[PDB]
C-alpha cells in the first residue's frame, strides 16, 4: 500500500546479516523475504523443542541490544521457570537521542523481526506477543500491521502454525510521546492501558509482567538476531566478530560526520573506525571534540580508540554515536541533554522529578549568562542528586553525560562561570 514518508537513512554493512535487505531504503515484503530463505529458520525452530531453542540462544552469547546488555538466552530461562501463561514483547519504543537503528529493520525488513518474534515466542511458550512501537513511528506501525497480515496469510501466524500445535497472535501497540515507555515496566503499564510509570524492580517482568504473568521484553535489534542463531546454529553465529562480544551490531551514527547513517559492524570495531573508516570522517575535516553515546555518556577525543562492545572500557550503551567537532559548544550541547531529561521524567520519584527540572532550568540560566553564584552551586548540586530513591534507570543517568562534560571540558564550563 502507500505508507507515510520516511527519510532515506543511509545504511551500510560489512556482515550482510541484519542489513542484508535493510541496506536498501524500501519495504521488503514477504515474497522478497521468502526468496532469501525467509521463515526457513522458523520452520527449523518448530521442529526443535522450546528448551533446545533457549539453549542455542544462550550459547550464541547474544546480549540485549536495548542498552543494558542482559544475556538473552538467560532472560528466557528465567521466564520459563515460572508458570504460564507467558507473554513476549518486542520493544520498539526507540526514543533515545541519536538512536535510529531499530526503525530501519522495522520499516525495511519487517519479516526479519516478525520471524524472530515467532521463534522467541515459541521458545518461551507465549501464545500472545506484542510489538510496542513509539507513536512517532507511524510508518513503522502500518508496515508492521501489513507484514503481520502477510505472515498470517502464509501460515506463519495463527493457530497450529505449520502443523506444530503452536498458536501465536502478534498485536501491535502504539506509544503516544513518552520516552519512559521504553523502560520495560512502563511499557507494560502502557500495554495495560495506563500511564507509563515504571514499577519497582524486582520483580522483573520475567517473574511478574503483563497482567502479573511471566513476560519477556526484548529490543527489536536483539530479536532480529534470532533468525541467524537458528539458521547458522549457535556455534557459527558465535564465530562472528570477537568471541567475547560475538555477532553483528547496528551503530546509528549522526552529527558532524560525512556519512551519517546506520552501520552493521562487528563489535571489535573501534569508535575511531566507526567515524573515520566507515562514516567518512568529519564534516569539513574538523577535529572531533566529543562523542555523545546517545544521552548516556560523553567521550572525549582522547577516547576514540575504544571498542564498540559491552566491555567496561568499551563504548557500551546501544552503540549510538553522535559526533561533535571542535567548534561545537559543549555547554550548549549539555543543555540539550538536560532538556531531554526534563521533558521525559515521569515524576514518580522526587529527586528525579525536581532534579531533571532544576538541572535544565539552572543550566539554561548558565547558558544565557543569567546565573547567580547560587545558581551555579545549585546546578552542581542538582546534577549530583537526581538519582537518589529513583526506581528506574532514567533517574540514575539523567546527570551522567552532563557530569562527564564538566569533568572532561572544564575550560569550556569555566568560560560560562566567568559570565
Amino acid at each position: 500500500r502507500s505508507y507515510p514518508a520516511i527519510p532515506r537513512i543511509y545504511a551500510e554493512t560489512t556482515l550482510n546479516m541484519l542489513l542484508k535487505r535493510a541496506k536498501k531504503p524500501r519495504v521488503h515484503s514477504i515474497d522478497e523475504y521468502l526468496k532469501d530463505g525467509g521463515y526457513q529458520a522458523l520452520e527449523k525452530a518448530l521442529n526443535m523443542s522450546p528448551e533446545e531453542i533457549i539453549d542455542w540462544v544462550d550459547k550464541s552469547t547474544l546480549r540485549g541490544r536495548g542498552g543494558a546488555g542482559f544475556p538473552t538466552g538467560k532472560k528466557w530461562k528465567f521466564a520459563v521457570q515460572n508458570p504460564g501463561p507467558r507473554y513476549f514483547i518486542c520493544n520498539a519504543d526507540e526514543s533515545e537521542p541519536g538512536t535510529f537503528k531499530d526503525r530501519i529493520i522495522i520499516e525495511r525488513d519487517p519479516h526479519l523481526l516478525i520471524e524472530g518474534i515467532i521463534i522467541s515466542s515459541y521458545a518461551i511458550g507465549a501464545n500472545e506477543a506484542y510489538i510496542y512501537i513509539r507513536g512517532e513511528y507511524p510508518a513503522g506501525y502500518y508496515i508492521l500491521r501489513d507484514a503481520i497480515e502477510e505472515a498470517k496469510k502464509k501460515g506463519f501466524l495463527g493457530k497450529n502454525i505449520l502443523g506444530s500445535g503452536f498458536d501465536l497472535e502478534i498485536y501491535v501497540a502504539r506509544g503516544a510521546g513518552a520516552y519512559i515507555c521504553g523502560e520495560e515496566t512502563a511499557l507494560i503499564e502502557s500495554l495495560e492501558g495506563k500511564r507509563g510509570h515504571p514499577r519497582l524492580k524486582p520483580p522483573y517482568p520475567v517473574q511478574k509482567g503483563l497482567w502479573g504473568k511471566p513476560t519477556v521484553v526484548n529490543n527489536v535489534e536483539t530479536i532480529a538476531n534470532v533468525r541467524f542463531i537458528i539458521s547458522m546454529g549457535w556455534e557459527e553465529y558465535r564465530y562472528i566478530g570477537p568471541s567475547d562480544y560475538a555477532g553483528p551490531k547496528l551503530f546509528p551514527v549522526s552529527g558532524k560526520v560525512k556519512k551519517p547513517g546506520v552501520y552493521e559492524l562487528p563489535m571489535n570495531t573501534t569508535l575511531r573506525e566507526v567515524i573515520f573508516k566507515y562514516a567518512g570522517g568529519t564534516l569539513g575535516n574538523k577535529k572531533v571534540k566529543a562523542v555523545f553515546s546517545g544521552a548516556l555518556d560523553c567521550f572525549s577525543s582522547e577516547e576514540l580508540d575504544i571498542p564498540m562492545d559491552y566491555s567496561p572500557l568499551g563504548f557500551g550503551g546501544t552503540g549510538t554515536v553522535i559526533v561533535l567537532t571542535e567548534e561545537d559548544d559543549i555547554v550548549e550541547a549539555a543543555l540539550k541533554i538536560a532538556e531531554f531529561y526534563e521533558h521525559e521524567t515521569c515524576g514518580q520519584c522526587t529527586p528525579c522529578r525536581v532534579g531533571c527540572y532544576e538541572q535544565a532550568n539552572l543550566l539554561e540560566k548558565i547558558y544565557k549568562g543569567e546565573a547567580t553564584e547560587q545558581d551555579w552551586e545549585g546546578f552542581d548540586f542538582v546534577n549530583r542528586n537526581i538519582q537518589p530513591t529513583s526506581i528506574c534507570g532514567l533517574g540514575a543517568v539523567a546527570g551522567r553525560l552532563i557530569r562527564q562534560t564538566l569533568e572532561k571540558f572544564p575550560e569550556e564550563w569555566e568560560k560560562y562561570r566567568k559570565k
Binding site: G177, P252, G255
Partner: protein, 158 residues
C-alpha cells in the same frame, strides 16, 4: 446541544481498536490517536464516551491524555508540524528550520496559523538523527534542507 456522540465512521474505527487486543482497555492509546486524527485534537467532551467504550473511569482516561505528549486537548490543527528540538537536530540546524517555518507560515513553536491549518509542535528526538534537522507533517517525516525546499514540502498539504 446534546450529549456528545462519536460520528459512526469514527465510532466504527474506535470499536475495531477496542476489539483488536484481548482486553478493551489496551486500546486506549490507539483510540486517542484515532480521535486526534479525526478532530485535529482531543475534544474534552470526547473522553467520557470513550471511557464508557473502554469500560474505564473518566479520571483514568483524563490522566492518560495528560500523560502522553502527542495528545493535544487545547488546539485544533489540520496539520501538526512536529519539529525536533533535541541535540542532533539542534547541532545540524533546528533553528534554521524554525526560522524558515516562521518566514513561510508566520508562527513560532506552540502556535497555530489563524486558519487552523498548521500548528508547530516542538518535540524530542524523532529517531531520524542522521537526517537532522528532522520534522514531521502529521505522519510524514522529512529532512529540512532549505526554506525553498521546505516551502515546496508544505505546499503538498492542502
Amino acid at each position: 446541544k446534546t450529549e456528545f456522540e462519536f460520528p459512526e465512521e469514527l465510532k466504527t474505527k474506535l470499536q475495531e481498536h477496542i476489539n483488536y487486543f484481548p482486553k478493551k482497555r489496551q486500546a486506549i492509546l490507539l483510540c486517542l490517536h484515532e480521535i486526534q486524527n479525526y478532530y485535529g485534537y482531543i475534544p474534552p467532551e470526547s473522553l467520557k464516551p470513550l471511557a464508557d467504550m473502554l469500560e474505564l473511569p473518566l479520571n483514568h482516561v483524563e490522566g492518560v491524555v495528560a500523560f502522553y505528549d502527542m495528545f493535544d486537548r487545547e488546539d485544533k490543527a489540520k496539520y501538526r508540524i512536529r519539529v525536533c528540538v533535541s541535540i542532533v537536530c539542534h547541532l545540524m540546524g533546528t533553528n534554521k528550520l524554525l526560522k524558515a517555518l516562521e518566514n513561510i507560515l508566520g508562527i513560532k513553536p506552540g502556535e497555530v496559523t489563524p486558519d487552523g491549518k498548521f500548528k508547530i509542535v516542538p518535540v524530542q528526538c524523532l529517531g531520524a538523527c542522521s537526517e537532522a534537522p528532522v520534522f514531521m507533517v502529521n505522519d510524514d517525516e522529512y529532512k529540512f534542507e532549505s526554506e525553498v525546499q521546505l516551502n515546496e514540502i508544505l505546499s503538498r498539504y492542502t
